[PDB]
Design a protein around this ligand. Structure first.
Ligand code: AG
Ligand code: AG
Ligand code: AG
Ligand code: CU
Ligand code: CU
Ligand code: CU
Ligand code: CU
Ligand code: O
Length: 462
């Protein structure tokens, strides 16, 4: 009765070493009602671009929208010139080609628009894809590896729709303060899908592709999840968890056991984030149904996944302070609107009003030049402010030293491109191995997209 989990195509290069991505407007059905949606190579979401470490690929990006957009590869360590930040304009009806020389370990990354001031909308409308980066190392592990059967991407996103069927997106005082969130949960575009998985291990590549909703993954019968990777690749070993908090733009890959005749749900648990526990999200919410199939999966859960370097010495490293803030007026007005619409349940558990170091994002004025090839220490503070800011830095995979006032949890102590900042201070160890000049600067920003779109971003050069 549930629709099957849609599986994004795993797209590799053709004879010319090219991948074609068409950005376009189509239609989808939600709850039997049609909406205009945008997608990459289809109506909605996108394919998974498969990359190999050490190899180049050229991506041809045809923008068939009637408005401008950009194409960013979130999690990829590439020069600014192909980063697809807001300076990477692709005119409506035009084409832009980018050559990606992949130089990082195996990981599940993703891609989405980075259009100046409109990224929340373009994502809400449907635009997101995946990136599966492979290397020599990972294939030796014998992980579940059959794409769409025992190795599946799970892109989880919320939307809200108006009475006429259409996606109801707005960037206004309330959303700019608390984020765009909705009442309907999608999994690879589908409402409460089911996925048929063989007996043994199921690998789920989880992406929180929500604009502003943080999620927290668990199983309906509390079977454990074994985390094997974070934003930037494998952990040294599996880390067993009963629940998995995932911030906006974060990825984790987990293994979960599948047994004959015992279906279970992947669920998300209520989070203590402003706006995000309004019913049906005040209770555990299903994400998808796992249907065991009485066929043996070949995949293993290895004792040992890979190696993390020790953290580099802290003495002598440059420190950059990035103070996050939101105009007090934006905050009071936004939270009032939140409380007035939804009341107390909204606490269960403006275009340049959001800033970093007192400055709302200035596309023409990068805030600093970072060293190339040198570890730096970036200290990101949300002190003075009560909103959730998952802070993301372009052009790198860093190590978390402190996450919002604490040492990182085990499954969060490996390769990360996002870090939690919420009323406290975070510190990360970051290195950039590629150039980004002022014309194609790197972004560092909050990934609660409505904050980003209203100033909580800076450009930096390498
Ligand atoms: Ag006011
Ligand atoms: Ag409140
Ligand atoms: Ag705030
Ligand atoms: Cu992103
Ligand atoms: Cu990014
Ligand atoms: Cu934020
Ligand atoms: Cu970004
Ligand atoms: O991003």
């Amino acid at each position: 009765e549930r629709p099957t989990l849609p599986i994004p195509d795993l797209l590799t290069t053709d004879a010319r070493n090219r991948i074609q991505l068409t950005i376009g407007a189509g239609q989808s059905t939600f709850g039997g009602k049609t909406a205009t949606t945008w997608g990459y190579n289809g109506n909605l979401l996108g394919p998974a671009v498969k990359l190999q470490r050490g190899k180049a690929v050229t991506v041809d990006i045809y923008n068939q929208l009637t408005e401008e957009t950009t194409l960013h590869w979130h999690g990829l360590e590439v020069p600014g010139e192909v980063d697809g930040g807001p300076q990477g304009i692709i005119p409506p009806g035009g084409k832009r080609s980018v050559t990606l020389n992949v130089d990082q370990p195996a990981a599940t990354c993703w891609f989405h628009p980075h259009q100046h001031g409109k990224t929340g909308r373009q994502v809400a409308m449907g635009l997101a894809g995946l990136v599966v980066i492979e290397d020599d190392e990972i294939l030796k592990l014998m992980l579940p590896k059959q794409w769409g059967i025992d190795d599946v991407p799970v892109i989880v996103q919320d939307k809200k729709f108006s009475a006429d069927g259409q996606i109801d997106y707005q960037l206004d005082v309330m959303t700019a303060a608390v984020g765009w969130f909705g009442d309907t949960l999608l999994t690879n575009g589908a409402i409460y899908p089911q996925h048929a998985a063989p007996r043994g291990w199921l690998r789920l590549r989880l992406l929180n592709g929500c604009n502003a909703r943080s999620l927290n993954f668990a199983t309906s019968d509390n079977r454990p999840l074994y985390v094997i990777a974070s934003d930037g690749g494998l952990l040294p070993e599996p880390v067993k968890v009963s629940e998995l908090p995932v911030l906006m733009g974060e990825r984790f890959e987990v293994l979960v056991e599948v047994n004959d005749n015992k279906p279970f749900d992947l669920v998300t648990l209520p989070v203590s984030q402003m706006g995000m526990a309004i019913a049906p999200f005040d209770k555990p919410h299903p994400v998808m149904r796992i249907q065991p199939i009485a066929i043996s999966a070949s995949g293993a859960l290895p004792d040992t996944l890979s190696s993390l370097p020790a953290l580099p010495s802290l003495e002598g490293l440059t420190v950059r302070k990035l103070q996050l803030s939101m105009d007090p007026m934006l905050d009071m007005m936004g939270m009032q609107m939140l409380m007035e619409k939804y009341g107390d349940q909204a606490m269960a558990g403006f275009h340049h009003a959001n800033k970093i170091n007192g400055q709302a994002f200035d596309m023409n004025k990068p805030m600093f030049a970072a060293a190339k090839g040198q570890y730096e220490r970036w200290v990101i503070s949300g002190v003075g402010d009560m909103m959730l800011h998952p802070f993301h830095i372009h052009g790198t995979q860093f190590r978390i030293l402190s996450e919002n006032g604490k040492p990182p949890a085990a499954h969060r102590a490996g390769w990360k491109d996002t870090v939690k900042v919420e009323g406290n201070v975070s510190e990360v160890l970051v290195k950039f191995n590629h150039d980004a000049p002022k014309e194609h600067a790197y972004m560092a920003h909050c990934h609660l997209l409505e904050h980003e779109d209203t100033g909580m971003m800076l450009g930096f050069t390498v």
